Amino acid sequence: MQLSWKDIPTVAPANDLLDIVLNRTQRKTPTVIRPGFKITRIRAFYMRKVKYTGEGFVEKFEDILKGFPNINDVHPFHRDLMDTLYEKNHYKISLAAISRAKSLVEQVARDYVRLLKFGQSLFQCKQLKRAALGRMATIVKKLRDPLAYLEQVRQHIGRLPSIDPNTRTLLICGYPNVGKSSFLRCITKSDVDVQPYAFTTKSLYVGHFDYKYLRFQAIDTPGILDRPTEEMNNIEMQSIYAIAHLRSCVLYFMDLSEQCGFTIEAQVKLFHSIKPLFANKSVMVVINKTDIIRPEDLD
Amino acid sequence: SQSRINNVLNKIHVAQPQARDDVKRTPFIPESVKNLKKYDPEDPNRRKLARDIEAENGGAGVFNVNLKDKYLLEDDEWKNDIMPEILDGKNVYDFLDPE
Amino acid sequence: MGRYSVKRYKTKRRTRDLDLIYNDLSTKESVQKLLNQPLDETKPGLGQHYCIHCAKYMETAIALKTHLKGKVHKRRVKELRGVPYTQEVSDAAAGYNLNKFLNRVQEITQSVGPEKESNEALLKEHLDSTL
Amino acid sequence: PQNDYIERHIKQHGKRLDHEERKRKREARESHKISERAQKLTGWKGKQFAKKRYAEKVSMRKKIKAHEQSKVKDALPTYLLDREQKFSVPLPKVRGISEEEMFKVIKTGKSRSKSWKRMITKHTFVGEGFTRRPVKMERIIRPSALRQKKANVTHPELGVTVFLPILAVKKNPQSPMYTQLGVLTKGTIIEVNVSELGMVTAGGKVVWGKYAQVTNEPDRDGCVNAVLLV
Amino acid sequence: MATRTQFENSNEIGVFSKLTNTYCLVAVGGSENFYSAFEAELGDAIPIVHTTIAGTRIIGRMTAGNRRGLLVPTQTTDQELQHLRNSLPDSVKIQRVEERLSALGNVICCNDYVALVHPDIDRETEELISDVLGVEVFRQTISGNILVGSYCSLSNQGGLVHPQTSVQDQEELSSLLQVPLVAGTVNRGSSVVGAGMVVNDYLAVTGLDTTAPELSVIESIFRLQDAQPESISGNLRDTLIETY
Amino acid sequence: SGNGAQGTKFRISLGLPVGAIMNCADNSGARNLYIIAVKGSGSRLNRLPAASLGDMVMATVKKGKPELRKKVMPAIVVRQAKSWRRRDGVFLYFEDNAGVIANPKGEMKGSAITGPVGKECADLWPRVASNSGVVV
Amino acid sequence: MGNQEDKENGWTSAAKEAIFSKGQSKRIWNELYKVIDSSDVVIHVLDARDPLGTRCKSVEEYMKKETPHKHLIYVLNKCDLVPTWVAAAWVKHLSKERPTLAFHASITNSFGKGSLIQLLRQFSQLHTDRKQISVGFIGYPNTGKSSIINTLRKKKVCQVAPIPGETKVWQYITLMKRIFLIDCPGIVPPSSKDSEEDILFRGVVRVEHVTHPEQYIPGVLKRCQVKHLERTYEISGWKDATEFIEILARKQGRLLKGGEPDESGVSKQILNDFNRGKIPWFVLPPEKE
RNA sequence: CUCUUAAGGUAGCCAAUGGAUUAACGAGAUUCCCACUGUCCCUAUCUA
Ligand SMILES: Nc1nc2c(ncn2[C@@H]2O[C@H](COP(=O)(O)OP(=O)(O)OP(=O)(O)O)[C@@H](O)[C@H]2O)c(=O)[nH]1
Ligand SMILES: [K+]
Ligand SMILES: [Mg+2]
Ligand SMILES: [Mg+2]
Ligand SMILES: [Mg+2]
Ligand SMILES: [Zn+2]
C-alpha cells in the first residue's frame, strides 16, 4: 500500500497553466526567424515551437495523472473514505478529462508538424504554428472546472492521516460529547480537539502508542446518530466505514449522566442499531464520566 | 494458518547447554562497576563527561584531546615524554627490552 | 622497461610464487587435492593434467608428458629445491629476527624438507605410471 | 499533522503579533505598487500587465452596471423549455491563385536535370477508391497529408456547426482544372453529407446531400470550414 | 542494561568499538560523543581507550579479546601497541599476532571461557589464542557462515546468532559454548549481529535503529536487567509472533 | 561521497575507467564485474569517469549465474592494480582489480569476501569491514 | 516477485538493444504506406514455419478500414521447410479469412508460380479498365518477397540475402505489360506482448548485433526437437543449453585462447542456422474441427 | 453451367539425389568475435 498521498505536484488552473506553458515555449525556444532565411530553417523553427509546446502540456498532464491515486486499486477502506470525501464519480471523470486532453494535445501536435512539412512561406508556417497553439489552448481552456476540483482534492487529500488497515487498531465510537477525543488525548499524543458541543470532530483522527513493545494505532471517529442509512450523512459515514472496514477492538463509549444531550436509552438503542457492524471484531463497552455518575447507583 | 510454523519455531526456540565437563563458568562484574552510580543527564551534581570538556574548551572538531592523560605509568611525570623511535638507522622498539 | 619484459611480467600476467608452490608440494593432502581436481569448463583440459611444480594446466596427458620430458620443467624443479626465501631470510640478512630465521631453517631441514621430497617422489612415480 | 492542522494551530496559538498591521500596510501599499509596476515593467510582461488591467476594469464596470440595474427594480412546449441548444453565394469573389502558387516543381534524376513533376501545395479531396499512379507516370502529386475527407459545416438556419464528410467537389472558382483535381480553396463549392441534419423534402424524401461553400484557407489554418447553402 | 547510540550516524557499534568486562576500546574519529556515550554507562570503573589500528577506525573488527587479554593483528604499529600497553593495566595481556586473517574481530568470537574461530586459522594462532585469552578453542561455522566474530555476539551469560541459523546448529553451538543461544536481528533487520552490537556481562550497546522487540530479545538473552532471565521468551512470544 | 559511505574520502589514484572489467571477490556467484559508471564522478569534456579503491560503481555481471546476469547493480571496489600512495609513506598496489556487489545503502549481497581488502575501502564501508576476513 | 523486488537492491535492467527495434523506423513505415497507396493488390507474405507469428494484423485492419477497394491476399512461402500436411492445414485455416496460396520461391525449381500468375491475370481482367495494376509485396523481414518476385520474373531482378533487411527501399518490376510488382522493405508492427526472444526467433534481426545469444539458446531447445538437433550437429547427451553449447563447441573446435569455448560465437551460429533453415522446425497448425 | 478451406499428430509420397542456401579462389563490397595495442582517458620522453 501507500497510506499517504501528500506527494502530488501543484495543479494549476486553466489560464495559469496556459500562461506557464506558453511563456515557457517563448523563453526556452529561440524567437528570431527571418523571411530571408531558407524555407527549411523556417519550417524547423515553427516545427520546434509546436512540438515543444505540445511536450510541455503533455508533461504537465502526466504529472497530474501519475500523482493521483487509483480509487479502484487502493484498499477498500481508503476507497470508501475517498468516495465519501471526494465523490468518486467526479474524481474519475476529472482524471479522465485530463487523460482525454493529453491525447488530444498529442494529436494536434503530430498533425500540425506533418502539415508544417509542406509550408511554402514564413507567413503560412506562422499561421500553421499559431493554429496549432490556439487549438491546444482551446483544449486546455475546456478543463477549467476539473482542474479547480483536482486542486482542491489534492490539497485536502495531502492532509489525510495514514491509517494502516492491517495493523493493530483500537477504534473509538459512540454518541457525540461522550469523551472519545478526551480518551484519545489520554492514551495517545494526538492533538484532537475537546469541546462540549456536538460534532466537534468532523474527520477521523489517529493516535499511536506501544503495548508490550508492539505498535498500536487508535482511531477516534466523529459521532454516530441513531438514524437509518438513507438519511445518514457523510460525516457519520466516515465512522460507519471505519467500523465496517477496520478489523479491530471497538470501544463504545456511554455517558450515563446525559451531559452529552442523549439519554441512556438512546445510547443503548444506538449500540443495538450498530450491533451488526462489529462482526468478527473485538467489542467492548466503556462507561465514561464516572466522576459525575456511577453505573452502580443507576435505576 | 499452517504456513508460519517453522519460521516462528526457529526463532522462538532458545537453545540450552548441557554439562560436557565439570568446569564452572561464572559471570564477572567488577566491584567498581557494581558500586557505580547511575548517570543523571539533568542533575546539578553529576560527572563532567568528555563531551562537556570538549564543549567548554573548543567544541567538536576544534578540541584537541590529550590521549597521554590516561596513561597508567610508574611516574606521572613520564606522561608527557616523547618516545624515541630512530637511532642511527635502527628501530628503538626492537631493541627495547627489560634486563 | 623494455617491451619484452614489460609484456611478460605485467601485473595482470603474473604467475604463482615459488614459496606458494613449495607449500603446495610440502603436504600430502595438498598434493592429493591438486591431483584430483573438480571438472572446470574454464580450464585447459577440464582442469585435469595439472603440473604442480610449474603450476600449469595442459590440454592433454600427452602434452603433460612432453612437458615433463623438458628442460623448462627441470628448471622449475631445480628452483624448487632449497629454502623457499620468504621475508625472514632478508630480515636475517639485514640482522633482524635471526633466531626466527634459524628456527625456520632447522624446521625446513628436519621436518618439512624430507616430507616434501617424498611427496615429490610419489608424485613423480604416479605421473610416470599413469602417463 | 492531520486534517486542518494549520487552522487548528491558528485557533490555538494565534498568528504572528504584527500580522494584521503588516497585512494592512501591504494592502495600503498596493496602489503605489500597481502604479510603479505599470510605469516600470517593460516588454512582454508590461504588455500582459496592461491587457490584464484593461480586462479587470471592464469586469468592474460590468459589475457596477449589473448592480445598478438590479437595484433599479420562442414559444417552446413544456418538455422543451428548461433546455438549451437572390441565388448569390456568400463568397461571389475570392483571391485569384496563379499556377505558380498552386504547383511546386519537383526535380528528378541523379543530377536533378528533369523538372516535369508538379506537387499541389493546397488541400485536396481525392474521393473514394483512390490509388496512386505509378511513379514513372505520376506527373501531378497530391500528398496524403494534404488530403481532406471532412469539413466543419455551419448551417445558417438553427445556428449550428457539424463535422460532415465530403462527397464531391463541384466548382473550384479558380479553374475547372482545379475542380477536376479536387483542390479545396476559399470559395470552392463542395458537396456534403447532411444525413445527421435531419432534412426532409416536402414530398417525404430524406435529404442526405447538399452544397456548401468553403469560407477559409485550409492551407493556412489546417482545417476546412464551410457554409451550407440553404 | 541495553543502550542505543551511534558512531557518527552509524549503527555499527561493533565495527567501531570493542567491549569486554574489564576495558573498552573506542575509535578516535571525530568528536567525543561516542566516548561520552560509553562513559555515561561505565563511569571510571573500567578503562576506556581511544585507539586506532593500522590507522583505521575499525577496531572492533580488527581486534579480539576478553577480560584477560587482547590480540591485535600484525598490521598494528609499534606506537599503537605501546599506546595500548600504556593505557591498559598489567592484568590485561597484549599480544600482536602474526596471522594471515588480519580481521581478528571477524574470525574470532570469544568470551571469558570459550572461543569459536575461523576453521582456516593457523595452529600457532590457535595456541596463541589459548595462551593469551585463556580459553578453549573450537573451529566452527555458524550454520555454514564463516566469520563467527561478525555473525555472533557472545558473553558469559548468553549469545545471539544470525537469524539464518538452524535449530540443530543452535543446539550444537550451545553445547559447545555452554551458554543459552537465540537467533534474531539487530539494527532493524541486520543479520550482522556481531558487528551490529557490543556486549559484556552487564552492558549492551546497539544502534539507534534497533527496535523495541529486538532490544527486549537482547536483554532477555544477555540477562542484563535485574529481572531479565532467558526464560521470558514464553512471555515475549506474543510480541515476537506479531513482530516476525 | 556516496550513500552509505562513512565519512569523507581522500583522493586515490584512479585505476578503473569505464569499460574496465574486474574480478568479483564476494560469494554471490558472479565471476567478474564490468564497470559502466562511477558514482560521484565529475563532469569534463572527453574525460572518462574512472574509479579507485573504495569507490562505488554501477556494474553488469559478464561471467556468473544467468539469473545474476543482464542487470545493473552497485559495486564497491576493494582491490586495484594501480599503485596509490598511503599517507604513512609508501606507494602500494595489488595483483588484480576486484570488487564486491552491494546495494545503494552499501550492504553486501554475499556473506564473505575472499582475498585481501584495502584499508581505505574497509574503513570507508562498515559492511565491507564486517564481511572481510583479510584487511591488507 | 518481479519488478518491485528488484529496485530495493538497486538492480536495474540493462538498456534495451537498438537492434531489436529494426523494422519499426519512420523511414520504413513511410515506404510501406507509399507502396500500399500505390498498390491495387497487396500480397501479404507469411512464413510457413510461423505464419501466425509473421502476420501484420494492424496493417490488415488499416487496409480493411481505410482502403477497402484494395485486394489483400496471403502467400504462404517456404512451404518446402514444413511437412506437406502442415502446409495443407495452414492453407485451410488461413483460407477461412483470406485467399491463401502455398508457395516455394526459387528461380529454377519453384512451386506455385503458375497459380500466382493466373491469379494476377484474373485480377488484371477484373481491372481491365485501369490500363495497369500494381501488386505490392508486404510482410515480415526475410519472409521472401524479393525471392517471390524473382521467381515470377524468372530472373534475379531483386537482391536477395539470408540476412534480414536486404531490401531497403521500394522497387518497381514489370511482370507483364499491364502488371507491375512493387518490392517493399520488411516491417515489424510495434507490440508490448512480443518480447525480444519472439522478435529474434521470427528472423527479424541480425544475430551479430545481439549481446548474449546464450540466453536465447534455450528458446532454440524448446522450439526444436532433440532428435533433429542431434542429427544436425552429430552430437548427443546434453541436459541443458550450456552443455549443448559446450559439446558443440568442443566438437567443432570453436575454442578461444586459454581453453574457454566460444559460447557467443557458437550460439550466434546456432541462431543463424535456426533462422536460415538448416535445423528443421515448425509451429503446430490449429486443431482440426 | 461450373471453379477455391478435400490432405493431419515433428517429416511424406513420387521419380544416390531432390540441388543456385554451389566447393575452391579474390590487393572486390560488408557485419561480428578472440588476440592485441598511445585509437582514446592524457599526454610525457628519446634519436636523426
Ligand atoms: N527454403 C526456402 N528458402 C527461401 C524461400 N524463399 C526465400 N528463401 C530464403 O530466405 C531468405 C530471405 O530471402 P529474401 O528474398 O531476401 O526475403 P525478404 O523478405 O525479401 O527479406 P528482406 O529483403 O531482407 O526484407 C533468402 O536467403 C532466401 O534464400 C523459400 O521459398 N524456401
Ligand atoms: K534478406
Ligand atoms: Mg470528538
Ligand atoms: Mg569528445
Ligand atoms: Mg527483399
Ligand atoms: Zn612442470
Author numbering:
A (entry chain b): 1 to 299
B (entry chain b): 350 to 448
C (entry chain I): 1 to 131
D (entry chain r): 2 to 74, 85 to 96, 117 to 261
E (entry chain y): 1 to 244
F (entry chain V): 2 to 137
G (entry chain m): 184 to 472
Direct quotes from the study:
Biogenesis of the large ribosomal (60S) subunit involves the assembly of three rRNAs and 46 proteins, a process requiring approximately 70 ribosome biogenesis factors (RBFs) that bind and release the pre-60S at specific steps along the assembly pathway. The methyltransferase Spb1 and the K-loop GTPase Nog2 are essential RBFs that engage the rRNA A-loop during sequential steps in 60S maturation. Spb1 methylates the A-loop nucleotide G2922 and a catalytically deficient mutant strain (spb1D52A) has a severe 60S biogenesis defect. Nog2 is an essential hub enzyme that acts as a key quality control element during the nucleoplasmic maturation of 60S, anchoring both the pre- and post-rotation states of the 5S rRNP (Nog2pre and Nog2post) via extensive rRNA and RBF interactions.
